[model samples]
Target: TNKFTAGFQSICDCYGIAQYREINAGLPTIVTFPFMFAIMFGDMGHGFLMTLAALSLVLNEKKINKMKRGEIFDMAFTGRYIILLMGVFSMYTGFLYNDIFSKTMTIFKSGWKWPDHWKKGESITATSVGTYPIGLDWAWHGTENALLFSNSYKMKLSILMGFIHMTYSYFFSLANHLYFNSMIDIIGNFIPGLLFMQGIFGYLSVCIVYKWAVDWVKDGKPAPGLLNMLINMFLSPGTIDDELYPHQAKVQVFLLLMALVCIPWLLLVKPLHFKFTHKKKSHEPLPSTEADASSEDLEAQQLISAMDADDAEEEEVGSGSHGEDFGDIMIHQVIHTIEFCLNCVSHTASYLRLWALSLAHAQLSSVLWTMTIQIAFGFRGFVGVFMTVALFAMWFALTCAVLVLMEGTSAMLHSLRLHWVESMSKFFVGEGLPYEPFAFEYKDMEVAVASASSSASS
Candidate 1:
């Protein structure tokens, strides 16, 4: 956790998730989190700086350790791996975006040639579809339509990733229920919840994938954009107003029905099973009604009645005490069911921030170049050289501050949000205590001193 973002593992602790000391789920976040961040914050120039920054931390690690542990140095020292990974992924995406200092590199066949006198910025139109550039997609290489193209591409990517991430979380929940052997919870809540997400967002991802495969612009089939297609199905299902593929329409219908069926499964299963199977209360030395329930079942109610206290940690009741309490179980079941259902919709939308931030980073980088470097390059003579030198320094500094530091930090935070909120919440019940055991690295020094003292005394 500390290997990626400063105090991120600590944040997970605050949320009650256990620290993974020995290669756990958080370990994968080292790669995945930064990869997502790179999708937005990709810039070769900025990435190079970040790479150096991470390397510096690595090189100066001993020095930093020798000094008082300042927060920034300490953070850099700890999160070096995360930063290094981020730098690598950022460079990869930067190349894919064909962006270096907010300019495109044409190391491939040209789609739209840049004009000598650029009017209204860069006038660009696709002549013919070109192959992917050695660095970035050839279609977006210095094109005026880069924003529109990247926006659609990245936004759809976000939706696809969001659904998959949530699916992974649901699987975790499935494994959890299976391990615990809560048939009611597994069959009722977990299975149906997973189905609901898969049926809806999973179907949306398919639509997105299929849409990407075809040139929807030529087909003119309402463009099959992910958010639009999803919203359209809900608002105008079965309406022949827009030209959707016949197969797409049929699949939507089937998936809708499947999702509808899962709704009742979520709402009814757990609560109803417990309600129907609840044993009638009886006061005796033992519970005459329920065979599975321990004496603690009777005592639990009595204790609850006396004080009416509840802390989930303290109330880690056995599975045998399953449906002892009536109102509590029903309330929790209702909450769990509703939260998942609503999140199935909301969490998918939450991933849109990926698109938003990516657009913002692109826009910001382009503006930085145009305002500073381009203007400096346009002048002539000694004034030109002096202006270029001054502006280059200014632009480089601003790029480090605004693009690398600010943008990267923002991307990291958002990535963490996607993991914790959209993904981990489905399965990880962070009721785990923080695992912070004591350590003594100075033991060697102490032993050395003790050995010297013993020798001197002898």
Candidate 2:
């Protein structure tokens, strides 16, 4: 409720334990937001420049590994794919920016520096700074005046994308609740998220028609059961009357809004509860939670030994020589397809930090540039270049490093979550041998058959 920074810092444990299923789904999904926007917003020239930085790092991975790891390779490798993908996104942005690797604007020989004067050019010079007035929520620098370019569409698109990412995560979160059959979490967490999404959609829908989310905000006020929800829905631009309304139409409209709000909210809770918890894990009678872990070990050991003992038992069955024809190879191919898509989406999402960090860097640059211009009342020469260039280099370098680390983290987190929670969780029998290496740890599980050895001796 207070300062966000302080509030966030205080809420260490905001939610309950994140189960493995939810952890895997929710974590990778975060990558989608930034990835989509960066692709949508970035200029190709700048994006490519950023990608090259990532590429160079990737190329030197082996060397980098040998060196003291400056960046966490676990995350960095995942991020490397993202960075490479963002480069592709950058190319598109470059087309829109019409700034193909700093092309020369030779088409305009009369060269007006202001952005309003449109001139087609094969290439624009990198030094050409201010030439266009961009829109609000979508502006770039201007020369001789301020606030030149408008990027409102891009802004709106990003916001829409943010909403989509939130909704996608919401459904997935609901699925998570279902997996654990958590009625409380489903109602409290997902229901609210869905409502919030509705509120956002309502706000935007009204904004397009009447200005803002005025009615939607009022809906947050504590309401009683069905009637209160009805009132709130009415407030969100749903007219209480439609045609030649005296009292009957008004009553009908009001009732319809009530039904809409009350039923979805109420029905949503129960069906979601019933559909998921219908049989419930307990009723379904799965392998007992109390099933001894040793049984899994014993089964694995037996299966392993059976492979070795196959020849001795070959005479038992009718034609036991050949293994049953392997299951359809198409299934493996399908799995590969899913993996490929997941990798693409996850990696692309990771690179979204490029756009966010770049914007932050730009804003910081803008602030400093504004300050420098205000102070430039003297012989602005070598000192000026030195001051500006040095600052630019420092800030850009800092931004690049931050993007690499941040995106790298996102990518790695997805990879780990997918592998550990999604992939490894499936393989679980609740009993896993310690992944011992051939070094010192090997002696630990050597498992000397001491009983068998003693029996043989006797």
Candidate 3:
């Protein structure tokens, strides 16, 4: 009787504690990108509609109250912000493209007008409702948009965002390192890894650019001996569509090899070699006979002391300038925190699939409905009208159902994962007590039982 709450109260208690909730606390950069991209890429009509739909998640009190009631306030708060941001972006992209519900509204041609000869059919099927230019198909035809810094520029934006996103991952890891212990590891290792993306990739590209120019002028001929090829290989951004560019792949493979080798030999290996070799440049470089054993002994003692302190701290509280309660929690929170940020990048990266799948779902449904309506139109009569509408409705239902199943799962996974990235705390955070809000459910139950007994006696 005490263990279980068998009625409405039980339901409320179970709902509060057992049911899960997802809420993002931090303003994640990944969330920012999708919202921005959607603005730049979404149809204004669709944007507004989606904005309304996204708001439904925040606005529907009954739904919110029923699901994740404990965290709903936070969820709705964050969600509204996301929707508002997305709505703004979607409207912008729509306005620029002059698209409304996948249909052109008008053409706002100020100076950029189609030539006299190249009319509607020539440029595109964009039938101007009035003045604004609408993208009738495939968001700027491949042939027209394919050029230097064209689609790549948009992709570059994504890449830039990705770079920031990747660094965001590094920051989380950095914080995690700091929390776990070893400020040196946090400052040194984590930061080096983060900077490597910018430094090495950017550096390699710059170096290879000079060579690319030379090789192009020389008709892909070697400039001189092996040195030109060796160096030029460093700069080449050899990849077409993520797969290796077949034309200069051999050169790339070789260069990639050399790049890997040179990095360690120069930066990593040589430094370590120098350290062990005792090749100090400034004060009487190189270890003498007397220095060898003494230096090695000092290093060993330092390592042991560090390890022992760590172990002792693990056993006792107030170990590292923090209480046992806070210290353990701090480390746990930090680990999960990095995990949180990484999930944001990955989940947002996942959201790239959202547009693709959404478009696929939309486009596929359009085709299906279009075909059905066309077939119904061919049937001939009043029955034909009814048939057309019925078929279309059924297809719409199927489309919605499929989207709900697919997109619902995607959104759910993403939201929870994002909640992690946003540093929303949940579950057992290192300690053994009630994970989130401490609740003496057993005590509550006993109280309820006592009250029931008193009421029964009365």
Candidate 4:
């Protein structure tokens, strides 16, 4: 269990300590990191192979540890659990995508049926029986318009998934605030930041869902262009060029106004509140240490005064002291508010890599199959059998090397980037020192003593 958790914890440790005395981000990273990788590397066949590889490592862990494995093998052994979980998640997501080795499976009857008669050159549309009970319809696979259909579906999936992932991480900030009991941070940072994020991206997420649920064809209205709607939401507020929902203009304007309000609130409130509180504190009278002292103890009084002067000088240089000019405070707050607002948009867009990489993985696998295995099967005689053997080896090597190793590595790195930059940025202070426990190994101690004794005798 400790080894398994260490695989995930090391990722967090790379960035910084999760916290000094609170729950570490590693607890969440164990699940989220693998799941995000699965979103990109989803392929049932490939994932199964990955699972087998990790399972082998896990089963022989004790034996492997006892052996002199290379550095690369040791690295893989350390992260075996992470690989196992990622492979499991990839299988699940691949199943959801109705993809296995870039081919769609027909576990259930397809929802669409071809017409009894159709001309080759002419366009023919299949009749719909009903929605597919699970995943995508098998009939859609091999259609000329399949790419178009999947593109739209995957794009929306990425956006919604990204939004939820980011929002989930953002709330980690709230947990830290509550734990530290920082009401000022909650008020000045968390609350306004949430309002700003939800006002813009939250509304965008809702619009994406609302568009998905609505049947514009049934209503005899053209489907609204969400990209255009969003662009116009800011470019031309209060104007509905493409209506998504009822009173969208009014709601959008309201959200935009609320988001605008948050900028000033986030920028000015905390610093001003801090200044007010500090002023109030400064107004209180200092305790009289002199009252307890005797007049005859002149030397003691002199020592006390010198200590007081030293303490005052230390306070002036202390990094924790917040006795900054109002201008400095304002400038810092401005930078923070601007950064938060901009990051909200950029980070949300960054999540789209999920869709981009998944599409690439699926396409690469399909191409590899067609170029290698499909050609191998075209042979028919003794010569054909020989070629098939050679080609099969080639295909297997490519699958293991290119698809499983190379693509898997890429996906893992991307997922790591997302967690580190997009998620951890919201809450992770990362300034706490790492805990190092003190211990002594008997073997190392014995070696050291022997070396020292030998040197002294010589």
Best TM-score goes to which candidate? Answer: 4
For each candidate in turn, give its C-alpha RMSD to the true structure in angstroms. 11.6, 19.1, 15.7, 11.9
Please give the CA lDDT of all the candidate structures.
0.46, 0.33, 0.34, 0.46
Clashes of 4: 0
TM-score of each: 0.63, 0.38, 0.38, 0.65
Which window of 10 residues has the lowest lDDT sum in candidate 1? 436-445
Using lDDT as the measure, name the better of candidate 3 and candidate 4: 4
lDDT of 4 by residue, 1-458 (tens): 35325532432233332332123433355567667766764433555555656577566555565554665554444345456566667655644553434453211222112211112311233322333322231221222123333344455556567667776766654454222332222334555666776765666556555555554444332233354344544554455344466434545565456557566556433433343322221112111123334334646555665322112122321112233444343334445556656766666666767656666666565455445554555555688577548766576655644555677677766776666565455534312112210012112111112231212211
Prediction 4 global C-alpha lDDT: 0.46
Tens digits of per-residue lDDT for model 2 on 349-405?
422333343444333323433444334434446776756555655565456445543
Q: Whose TM-score is higher: candidate 3's or candidate 4's?
A: 4
**Model 2 segments beyond 4 Å from truth?**
1-45, 61-75, 78-157, 171-199, 202-259, 266-362, 365-458
Could you give candidate 1's per-residue lDDT for residues 1-458 as a string of tens digits?
22423343433333222222212333334455567666555433665555556576656545654564665553454455455566667766764554433344221222122222134333333323343221132221133223333444445455566556555545543453332322222334545666676776666656655555554444444443533454544644554442366345555465456657566756544433344223222111112344456566756766776321122212322112233353454455555556657666666665666556666676566455445554444545577577447766576656545655676677766765655564345423311222211012212111112231212211
Where does candidate 4 clash, by residue pair? none
Minimum summed lDDT over a 10-residue window in model 3 is located at 17-26
Q: How many backbone clashes does every candidate have?
A: 2, 18, 11, 0
Off by over 4 Å in 1: 1-23, 61-68, 95-145, 164-185, 217-220, 224-231, 234-246, 255-258, 271-327, 380-403, 430-458
